Amino acid sequence: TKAGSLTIVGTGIESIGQMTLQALSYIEAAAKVFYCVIDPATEAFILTKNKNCVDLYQYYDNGKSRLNTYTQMSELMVREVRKGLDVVGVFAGHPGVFVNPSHRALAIAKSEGYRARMLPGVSAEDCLFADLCIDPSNPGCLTYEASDFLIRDRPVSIHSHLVLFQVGCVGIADFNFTGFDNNKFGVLVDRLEQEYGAEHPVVHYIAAMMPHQDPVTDKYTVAQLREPEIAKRVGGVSTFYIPPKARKASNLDIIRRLELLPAGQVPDKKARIYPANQWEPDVPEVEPYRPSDQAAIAQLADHAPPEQYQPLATSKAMSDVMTKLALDPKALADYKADHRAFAQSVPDLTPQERAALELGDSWAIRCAMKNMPSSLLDAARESGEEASQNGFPWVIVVGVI
Amino acid sequence: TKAGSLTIVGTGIESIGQMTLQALSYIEAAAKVFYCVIDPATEAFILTKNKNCVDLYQYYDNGKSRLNTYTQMSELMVREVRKGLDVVGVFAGHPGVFVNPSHRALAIAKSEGYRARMLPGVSAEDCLFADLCIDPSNPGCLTYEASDFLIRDRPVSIHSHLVLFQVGCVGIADFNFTGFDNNKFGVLVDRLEQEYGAEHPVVHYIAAMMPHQDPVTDKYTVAQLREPEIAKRVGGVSTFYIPPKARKASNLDIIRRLELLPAGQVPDKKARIYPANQWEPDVPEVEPYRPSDQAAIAQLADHAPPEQYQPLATSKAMSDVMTKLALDPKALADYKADHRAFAQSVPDLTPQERAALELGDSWAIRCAMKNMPSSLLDAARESGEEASQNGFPWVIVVGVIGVI
Ligand SMILES: C[S@@+](CC[C@H](N)C(=O)[O-])C[C@H]1O[C@@H](n2cnc3c(N)ncnc32)[C@H](O)[C@@H]1O
Ligand SMILES: C[S@@+](CC[C@H](N)C(=O)[O-])C[C@H]1O[C@@H](n2cnc3c(N)ncnc32)[C@H](O)[C@@H]1O
Numbered sequence: 001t002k003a004g005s006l007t008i009v010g011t012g013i014e015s016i017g018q019m020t021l022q023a024l025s026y027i028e029a030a031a032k033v034f035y036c037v038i039d040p041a042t043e044a045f046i047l048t049k050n051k052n053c054v055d056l057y058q059y060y061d062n063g064k065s066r067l068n069t070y071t072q073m074s075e076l077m078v079r080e081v082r083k084g085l086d087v088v089g090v091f092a093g094h095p096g097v098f099v100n101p102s103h104r105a106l107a108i109a110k111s112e113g114y115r116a117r118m119l120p121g122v123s124a125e126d127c128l129f130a131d132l133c134i135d136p137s138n139p140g141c142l143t144y145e146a147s148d149f150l151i152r153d154r155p156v157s158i159h160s161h162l163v164l165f166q167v168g169c170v171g172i173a174d175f176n177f178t179g180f181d182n183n184k185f186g187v188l189v190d191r192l193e194q195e196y197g198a199e200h201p202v203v204h205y206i207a208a209m210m211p212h213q214d215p216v217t218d219k220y221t222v223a224q225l226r227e228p229e230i231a232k233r234v235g236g237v238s239t240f241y242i243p244p245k246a247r248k249a250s251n252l253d254i255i256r257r258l259e260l261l262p263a264g265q266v267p268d269k270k271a272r273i274y275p276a277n278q279w280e281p282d283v284p285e286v287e288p289y290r291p292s293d294q295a296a297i298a299q300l301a302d303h304a305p306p307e308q309y310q311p312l313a314t315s316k317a318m319s320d321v322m323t324k325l326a327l328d329p330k331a332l333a334d335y336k337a338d339h340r341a342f343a344q345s346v347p348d349l350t351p352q353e354r355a356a357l358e359l360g361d362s363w364a365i366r367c368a369m370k371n372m373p374s375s376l377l378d379a380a381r382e383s384g385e386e387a388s389q390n391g392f393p394w395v396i397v398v399g400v401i
Numbered sequence: 402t403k404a405g406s407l408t409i410v411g412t413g414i415e416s417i418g419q420m421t422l423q424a425l426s427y428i429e430a431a432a433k434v435f436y437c438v439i440d441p442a443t444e445a446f447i448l449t450k451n452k453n454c455v456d457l458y459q460y461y462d463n464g465k466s467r468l469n470t471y472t473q474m475s476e477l478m479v480r481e482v483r484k485g486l487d488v489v490g491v492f493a494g495h496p497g498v499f500v501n502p503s504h505r506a507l508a509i510a511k512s513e514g515y516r517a518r519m520l521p522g523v524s525a526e527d528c529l530f531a532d533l534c535i536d537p538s539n540p541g542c543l544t545y546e547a548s549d550f551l552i553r554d555r556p557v558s559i560h561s562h563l564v565l566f567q568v569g570c571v572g573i574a575d576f577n578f579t580g581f582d583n584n585k586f587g588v589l590v591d592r593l594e595q596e597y598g599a600e601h602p603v604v605h606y607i608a609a610m611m612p613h614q615d616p617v618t619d620k621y622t623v624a625q626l627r628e629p630e631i632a633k634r635v636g637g638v639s640t641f642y643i644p645p646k647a648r649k650a651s652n653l654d655i656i657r658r659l660e661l662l663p664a665g666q667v668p669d670k671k672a673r674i675y676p677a678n679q680w681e682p683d684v685p686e687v688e689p690y691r692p693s694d695q696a697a698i699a700q701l702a703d704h705a706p707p708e709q710y711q712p713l714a715t716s717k718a719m720s721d722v723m724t725k726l727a728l729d730p731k732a733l734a735d736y737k738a739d740h741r742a743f744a745q746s747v748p749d750l751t752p753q754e755r756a757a758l759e760l761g762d763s764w765a766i767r768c769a770m771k772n773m774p775s776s777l778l779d780a781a782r783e784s785g786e787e788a789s790q791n792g793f794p795w796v797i798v799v800g801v802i803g804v805i
Contacts, residue, residue: 020419
């Protein structure tokens with residue numbers, strides 16, 4: 001309903017490959033691209049994909065306040081939005097994770113009535129989970145900016161994951177082309193010593209930024225971070241992962257109210273699902289092949305799909321259109337403008353496929369692309385009111401479930 | 402050296418478009434693909450990219466324990482790894498975020514001496530930050546699985562973001578094709594009432610799973626979650642976001658030790674950097690264009706890049722090879738095996754480009770791809786240290802920083 005749009009997208013952390021297909025598609029479709037990325041291969045890639053790019057990094061300077069820079073970056077984007085253009089902003093990682101100017105620009109554009117969207121990307125924390133072989137679900141995850149962690153005295157949980165961004169320049173972090181002096185690093189180490197003890201592990205993590213490099217996953221004690229040669233390794237792309245120090249016990253009241261007792265008691269609080277977190281101090285070895293695991297594996301020989309399983313049964317024409325809607329922003333905009341008129345223009349759809357697309361309905365799309373068996377709908381009819389998507393994947397964190 | 406590998410990748414949350422370029426490239430290059438995705442368009446897309454796919458979802462069944470299913474899913478992948486094949490596992494979102502079988506399979510493969518890697522993807526939490534317009538950095542973020550949150554009595558912080566996954570089946574969540582019965586949801590609501598009060602907002606979040614659908618971003622009070630017509634909207638793809646109830650003050654000792662002085666007038670604890678979190682209750686309106694913002698904008702007219710700014714200055718041949726290494730897993734494997742032989746096979750590189758690639762050094766690559774000015778290297782050489790990457794982007798969360 002008004003000309004002009006702002007879409008902010010991420011590149012991910014590792015050069016080129018961690019960009020999403022949709023982020024690429026918006027970069028190619030844009031009238032104007034504004035980017036801020038440290039990696040030159042990623043910068044070069046972006047410039048091959050759009051003819052009208054501006055490097056936002058040129059608005060930093062020595063002794064020029066970051067906030068003034070962020071104001072300038074956002075204003076450069078919003079000015080093009082105001083002139084009626086489809087503008088794309090590009091930042092490293094996930095563009096809304098530990099980033100100032102993306103949020104500012106989107107809020108401004110939205111407040112003046114323009115279309116404004118952030119697209120998610122792969123963050124440094126996403127990379128951390130992948131490279132350290134941890135899951136934030138087990139046993140929960142606290143994530144802070146290191147200076148904020150200190151200044152606001154943010155609480156830690158010794159029973160959960162802790163991730164600290166921006167450990168490489170605690171306190172004042174004035175822009176400087178020839179680098180930070182992390183002269184207040186000891187204030188962070190002090191806090192870590194108070195919370196965890198001098199012998200507790202801290203993992204220095206740096207995701208590889210090129211496809212070929214290995215990640216830095218260096219474990220140190222809190223005490224070792226005081227050594228000058230170790231402290232010097234922590235720079236502007238360093239993140240700290242602090243593993244839990246202990247395992248939290250279960251709450252008897254909740255166990256009862258959730259009916260997890262079979263007139264009997266749960267797994268011991270250290271009776272872990274394989275694999276254990278390898279960074280956790282004094283982590284005991286967990287057996288991957290218990291008798292129950294071996295029995296489950298034995299059943300694979302006799303396995304067939306359950307009668308309620310819904311095999312995919314689609315067509316080239318339908319997969320092509322669903323792919324086009326995900327990868328062509330213009331096609332998506334058109335479809336959202338008028339489901340019918342779009343659905344009518346698509347070649348080679350069956351009547352069901354056309355109808356489902358026209359209708360705007362997840363269930364219709366599912367039926368069009370999956371063979372739904374009688375035993376599923378008979379069970380969905382005999383119990384309840386109407387059928388929908390069910391049978392969800394689900395992480396088990398507590399041993400009982 | 403040992404034959405066989407396992408790479409586990411994500412699809413992201415929204416159909417197709419949230420898969421990474423590298424996830425796609427590994428799916429295409431794999432000898433065998435094992436996938437577990439709910440979205441049929443994503444399943445169809447995967448099947449068009451590799452000829453040898455297996456749907457892991459078929460190993461679920463009614464009243465069959467999920468742990469047994471996960472054991473089976475892992476074992477199917479690891480069997481093909483032990484046979485010396487390049488195997489790819491595909492799960493929704495980020496394949497290591499709230500997922501059991503990926504971690505099991507990788508840990509087994511790795512313990513038996515096979516190459517094993519997880520590639521990150523876009524999670525439902527990444528989607529949540531983007532759709533709710535929040536930054537986990539401001540003012541920190543706590544993330545839990547809902548049943549674990551309750552059973553282990555995990556702490557909340559009323560001053561930070563809280564994100565809860567799997568709110569649609571609190572407690573026993575046995576597999577059922579016709580869906581969960583969320584009859585213990587009240588146990589979660591009681592906990593939220595105790596921690597936050599009955600009138601505090603909870604945001605029911607469901608990311609759009611078709612490119613065209615819109616996100617669900619519905620704000621309710623904790624009390625409203627007890628209404629049957631509201632509680633029934635919560636399902637298997639629901640996540641809750643609970644915004645902070647208050648702003649935390651600064652610590653005077655830390656202010657001093659970090660030298661964020663003088664006078665005793667740091668920014669007030671509610672003096673926010675624009676924009677404010679719109680979900681936070683009684684959030685005061687923040688001014689986007691303060692006098693200093695207007696002055697910064699006035700300087701745009703006379704702006705030129707500083708002396709130390711490094712323009713990109715590369716070639717078609719160099720951007721091509723760097724792109725190939727990011728997008729072609731075979732090409733990358735060759736390059737890592739022998740930098741020199743790979744770099745000498747590459748057509749049309751200049752001597753420096755060739756040389757930088759032979760070395761495998763971030764800094765050599767940067768010099769080959771950017772024009773480094775004298776002002777920058779004269780500053781590095783005056784220090785007595787070789788130049789490296791500096792001038793990092795940095796989020797400002799504490800308002801005192803940025804005022805200095
Ligand atoms: C201003 S933030 C930007 C984060 C980015 N938007 C993201 O999605 O992660 C900079 C901080 O992110 C983290 N970071 C950036 N690159 C990284 C890397 N290669 N490895 C580990 N952490 C990184 C560090 O904590 C760094 O100080
Ligand atoms: C087994 S987990 C898997 C998460 C996935 N690996 C990821 O990266 O987010 C399932 C939970 O993820 C969250 N989730 C999955 N799809 C979602 C969506 N479309 N919107 C919001 N949350 C979602 C919900 O909390 C759901 O209960």
